[PDB]
Design a protein around this motif. Sequence first.
Motif, PDB file in Angstrom:
ATOM      1  N   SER A  12      -5.612  68.568  89.648  1.00  0.00           N
ATOM      2  CA  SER A  12      -5.493  67.122  89.814  1.00  0.00           C
ATOM      3  C   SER A  12      -6.189  66.402  88.669  1.00  0.00           C
ATOM      4  O   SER A  12      -7.285  66.809  88.229  1.00  0.00           O
ATOM      5  CB  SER A  12      -6.055  66.659  91.160  1.00  0.00           C
ATOM      6  OG  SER A  12      -7.441  66.961  91.228  1.00  0.00           O
ATOM      7  N   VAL A  13      -5.543  65.333  88.195  1.00  0.00           N
ATOM      8  CA  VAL A  13      -6.068  64.526  87.089  1.00  0.00           C
ATOM      9  C   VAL A  13      -5.984  63.034  87.412  1.00  0.00           C
ATOM     10  O   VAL A  13      -4.940  62.531  87.848  1.00  0.00           O
ATOM     11  CB  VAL A  13      -5.321  64.815  85.757  1.00  0.00           C
ATOM     12  CG1 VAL A  13      -5.728  63.823  84.671  1.00  0.00           C
ATOM     13  CG2 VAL A  13      -5.542  66.258  85.288  1.00  0.00           C
ATOM     14  N   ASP A  58     -11.609  64.929  95.872  1.00  0.00           N
ATOM     15  CA  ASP A  58     -11.606  64.226  94.549  1.00  0.00           C
ATOM     16  C   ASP A  58     -10.973  65.071  93.402  1.00  0.00           C
ATOM     17  O   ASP A  58     -10.507  66.197  93.621  1.00  0.00           O
ATOM     18  CB  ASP A  58     -13.020  63.670  94.194  1.00  0.00           C
ATOM     19  CG  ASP A  58     -14.113  64.771  94.062  1.00  0.00           C
ATOM     20  OD1 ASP A  58     -13.868  65.933  94.460  1.00  0.00           O
ATOM     21  OD2 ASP A  58     -15.235  64.468  93.564  1.00  0.00           O
ATOM     22  N   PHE A  59     -10.969  64.516  92.188  1.00  0.00           N
ATOM     23  CA  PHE A  59     -10.175  65.031  91.065  1.00  0.00           C
ATOM     24  C   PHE A  59     -10.808  66.186  90.282  1.00  0.00           C
ATOM     25  O   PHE A  59     -12.028  66.237  90.116  1.00  0.00           O
ATOM     26  CB  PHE A  59      -9.804  63.869  90.129  1.00  0.00           C
ATOM     27  CG  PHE A  59      -8.953  62.817  90.793  1.00  0.00           C
ATOM     28  CD1 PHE A  59      -7.556  62.972  90.869  1.00  0.00           C
ATOM     29  CD2 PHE A  59      -9.539  61.685  91.371  1.00  0.00           C
ATOM     30  CE1 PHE A  59      -6.756  62.016  91.499  1.00  0.00           C
ATOM     31  CE2 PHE A  59      -8.741  60.723  92.005  1.00  0.00           C
ATOM     32  CZ  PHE A  59      -7.351  60.889  92.069  1.00  0.00           C
ATOM     33  N   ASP A  60      -9.973  67.112  89.809  1.00  0.00           N
ATOM     34  CA  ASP A  60     -10.444  68.178  88.903  1.00  0.00           C
ATOM     35  C   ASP A  60     -10.838  67.623  87.547  1.00  0.00           C
ATOM     36  O   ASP A  60     -11.869  68.013  86.980  1.00  0.00           O
ATOM     37  CB  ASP A  60      -9.399  69.282  88.744  1.00  0.00           C
ATOM     38  CG  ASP A  60      -9.136  70.018  90.035  1.00  0.00           C
ATOM     39  OD1 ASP A  60     -10.115  70.525  90.621  1.00  0.00           O
ATOM     40  OD2 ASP A  60      -7.967  70.090  90.462  1.00  0.00           O
ATOM     41  N   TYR A  61     -10.036  66.690  87.031  1.00  0.00           N
ATOM     42  CA  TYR A  61     -10.359  66.072  85.744  1.00  0.00           C
ATOM     43  C   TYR A  61     -10.265  64.576  85.801  1.00  0.00           C
ATOM     44  O   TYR A  61      -9.428  64.012  86.519  1.00  0.00           O
ATOM     45  CB  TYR A  61      -9.452  66.613  84.622  1.00  0.00           C
ATOM     46  CG  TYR A  61      -9.532  68.111  84.448  1.00  0.00           C
ATOM     47  CD1 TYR A  61     -10.471  68.670  83.588  1.00  0.00           C
ATOM     48  CD2 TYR A  61      -8.679  68.971  85.149  1.00  0.00           C
ATOM     49  CE1 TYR A  61     -10.566  70.048  83.417  1.00  0.00           C
ATOM     50  CE2 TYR A  61      -8.768  70.371  84.990  1.00  0.00           C
ATOM     51  CZ  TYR A  61      -9.724  70.891  84.116  1.00  0.00           C
ATOM     52  OH  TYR A  61      -9.854  72.246  83.910  1.00  0.00           O
ATOM     53  N   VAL A 120     -16.497  57.467  90.060  1.00  0.00           N
ATOM     54  CA  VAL A 120     -15.718  58.692  90.363  1.00  0.00           C
ATOM     55  C   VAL A 120     -16.272  59.878  89.602  1.00  0.00           C
ATOM     56  O   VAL A 120     -16.821  59.730  88.491  1.00  0.00           O
ATOM     57  CB  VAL A 120     -14.212  58.695  89.944  1.00  0.00           C
ATOM     58  CG1 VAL A 120     -13.267  58.669  91.131  1.00  0.00           C
ATOM     59  CG2 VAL A 120     -13.882  57.742  88.807  1.00  0.00           C
ATOM     60  N   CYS A 121     -16.050  61.055  90.171  1.00  0.00           N
ATOM     61  CA  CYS A 121     -16.537  62.299  89.593  1.00  0.00           C
ATOM     62  C   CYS A 121     -15.383  63.281  89.420  1.00  0.00           C
ATOM     63  O   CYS A 121     -14.423  63.266  90.197  1.00  0.00           O
ATOM     64  CB  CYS A 121     -17.702  62.888  90.428  1.00  0.00           C
ATOM     65  SG  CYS A 121     -19.135  61.757  90.545  1.00  0.00           S
ATOM     66  N   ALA A 122     -15.466  64.090  88.370  1.00  0.00           N
ATOM     67  CA  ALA A 122     -14.543  65.211  88.174  1.00  0.00           C
ATOM     68  C   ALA A 122     -15.200  66.495  88.685  1.00  0.00           C
ATOM     69  O   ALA A 122     -16.386  66.728  88.426  1.00  0.00           O
ATOM     70  CB  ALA A 122     -14.186  65.351  86.698  1.00  0.00           C
TER      71      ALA A 122
END
Length: 565
Positions: free
Chosen positions: A27-28, A1-4, A261-263
């Motif tokens: 990743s964003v 999943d995403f960093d931000y 979704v989670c950062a």
Amino acid sequence: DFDYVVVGAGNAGNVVAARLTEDPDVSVLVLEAGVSDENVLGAEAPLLAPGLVPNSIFDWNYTTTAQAGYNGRSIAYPRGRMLGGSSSVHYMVMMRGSTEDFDRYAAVTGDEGWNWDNIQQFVRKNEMVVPPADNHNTSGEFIPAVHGTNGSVSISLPGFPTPLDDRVLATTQEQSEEFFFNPDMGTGHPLGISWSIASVGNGQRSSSSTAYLRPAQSRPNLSVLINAQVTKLVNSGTTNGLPAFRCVEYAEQEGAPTTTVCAKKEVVLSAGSVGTPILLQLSGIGDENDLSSVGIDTIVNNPSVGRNLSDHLLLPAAFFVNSNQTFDNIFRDSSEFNVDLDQWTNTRTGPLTALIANHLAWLRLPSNSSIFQTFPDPAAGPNSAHWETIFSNQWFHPAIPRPDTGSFMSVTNALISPVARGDIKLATSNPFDKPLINPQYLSTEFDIFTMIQAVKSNLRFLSGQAWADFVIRPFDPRLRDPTDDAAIESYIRDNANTIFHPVGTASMSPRGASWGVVDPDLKVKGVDGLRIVDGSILPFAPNAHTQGPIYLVGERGADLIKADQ
Ligand SMILES: Cc1cc2nc3c(=O)[nH]c(=O)nc-3n(C[C@H](O)[C@H](O)[C@H](O)COP(=O)(O)OP(=O)(O)OC[C@H]3O[C@@H](n4cnc5c(N)ncnc54)[C@H](O)[C@@H]3O)c2cc1C
Ligand SMILES: COc1ccc(C(=O)O)cc1
């Protein structure tokens, strides 16, 4: 999943997303509630901008509460709902603010990283001067050295001339004590009459999506989702002894199922001055009493959420003119419009490249004004404005349609240094209901006094020799007589509106401080993993249309985020 996760693909959001993904290992995910900005002619041809919002699929369709200052009138509160946010619907005028704006931001936060000198590096990152559409000689219209040459957003001098231009210039000579010429607002000294600079390149809008998102579209570490409205920020545990908010819920529309979704690192709120505080309140970050009155449990009690709202109020005024060169007939006569559209389509030149205004005046009350008995000076400082005056080669009025007959020029004022403060609040706990937007316009004696003065100033301006054969009369007869204060005040209270520059609803303030919503590094107070990068952080109305200062917030915000990696 995403960093931000970036909430809102807007003026500031797109800067953050593009800047962060310059690093291939970061990743964003961008979540935008609205539709694409592609194939929106109205969002590409500069002159077509005013048609786009307020009542449309590209608007959030917000309004204000009824304003007692406006004789009970409620007004449209347009906000862009699309890739680019309000930068896809705005009128493209570009300036950064006064040196005093940014020095006051630094003083009020204890962070010198705001402050005029230290912000200049971001002007250079943000903008590049390109030719105006008509390719006229720009010598003496701006100072190249104070502007970027290499940055992301294209800016230029007005791409199409108007019969107003020479007459505004002549008035700076004829009435030089009141209306002196200013070579460039980029000096940080706003006062006087300057040529407009606008986020337009090759005769079309340069928005945050065209400038930042599009060039970055082939990056595998960037994802952009449209038709994705974030409905809740989710308390996802406890890191650093504070409630953590690294997860979001979003949906396509009311009644649709919510995706989670989670950062890994942070959620960045870039939902803007209306969107940011309301989402916070919907997530249980806000005024305890207001939240429970609509059925929400408070997770973080902060009564500053949605408070300290400043805006620039707007005053419109049309005048009949003796000219066949106003832009009015472009919006009445299909043949003329279509000739102009073909020229714009084929060559990116002509009347459709024209701005709302080619010149702007930034003005102060006399330092001995009677109003200063009862009020301290609300301006950012002695070199900053009280009001602005904008000269347009056509009818311009947000609440009254263009008359079928007549050629017009308009003189629009903005109150730059209001004493009034307002708020944004939830009417219900439903994320798809409209919020309560109460700016409290004209609720102080200062604000009405200044606007009465602004009108007298407009009439001095237009009584000049340069205007003698041009200005026929005001559209509204309450503007016939500069000494009739009752008629002038009635005009103001019936016609005043907004110039669409809200700030302050999530104000930055010093670490651990009294009021405010975020720290000087833009981290939400009393929360971990949540950052706000948009107009809501600015604690005072700047000496500027807000795209310029907001882009600076975006560029610094990105650096602030990178520093915590
Ligand atoms: C009609 C009009 C004309 C203007 N003209 C000018 C001008 O000439 N010059 C100037 O400097 N400024 C102008 N402005 C102001 C300028 O456009 C804004 O001040 C600035 O662009 C706002 O930047 P922002 O990043 O804070 O918010 P925005 O650019 O508004 O970005 C917020 C984004 O977040 C999205 N969003 C909001 N809530 C959610 C959610 N819950 N989930 C997902 N997405 C969400 C929105 O759809 C939007 O895309 C104008 C504004 C308007 C309305
Ligand atoms: C009358 O012209 C303008 C110019 C800029 C804006 C704005 O910044 O919203 C509004 C009206």
